[PDB]
Design brief:
Chains A, B: This is DUF357 domain-containing protein. It is classed as structural genomics, unknown function. The entry lists the keywords Protein Structure Initiative, New York SGX Research Center for Structural Genomics. The assembly is dimeric. 2 copies of one chain form a homodimer. Chain A is mainly α and 76 residues long. Chain A has a single domain, classed as Substrate Binding Domain Of Dnak, Chain:A, Domain 2 (Up-down Bundle), CATH 1.20.1270. In chain A, 78% of the residues lie in helices and 8% in strands. In chain A, strands 1-2 form a two-stranded antiparallel ribbon. In chain A, α1 runs antiparallel to α2, α1 packs parallel to α3 and α2 runs antiparallel to α3. The longest helix of chain A is centred in the middle third of the chain and has 20 residues. The radius of gyration of chain A is 12 Å and the shape is elongated. The relative contact order of chain A is 0.21.
Chain lengths: 76, 76
């Protein structure tokens, strides 16, 4: 149930960002960080490390959202 | 045990940032976001919403770390 809640949220945000990353462009470091935590969330999700899996999806989203906010990233 | 793992990590990162926020200065929006998710992590942690509690601590840290990286925030 806590396992259920973390799995559902991780997958939800991970499926969203795998699409979202494709819609934005900009600073290559920001973009590399994004893919780096996307890869890591995917990897931990698969082997069942749910806390690290969720932790990496939130970092991926923060680099993405904050990148957009400060104009290091732009929608295509 | 998953409850244990989320509680331990949330508290650990929350006690660290409550100190850390005091050591840095800069852009007031960045700083307001930081305190806003610190407040929210504290609130969810207390009522037992562990996933949202952890989720807010990671956002608080990302605004802080990324703020430092892009030089919107500085160590005092």
């Amino acid at each position: 149930s806590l396992e259920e809640e973390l799995r559902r949220e991780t997958l939800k945000w991970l499926e969203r960002i795998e699409e979202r990353v494709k819609e934005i462009e900009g600073d290559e470091g920001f973009m590399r960080n994004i893919e780096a935590y996307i890869s890591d969330s995917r990897y931990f999700l698969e082997k069942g490390d749910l806390v690290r899996a969720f932790e990496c999806v939130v970092w991926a989203w923060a680099w993405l959202e904050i990148g957009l906010e400060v104009g290091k990233l732009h929608e295509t």
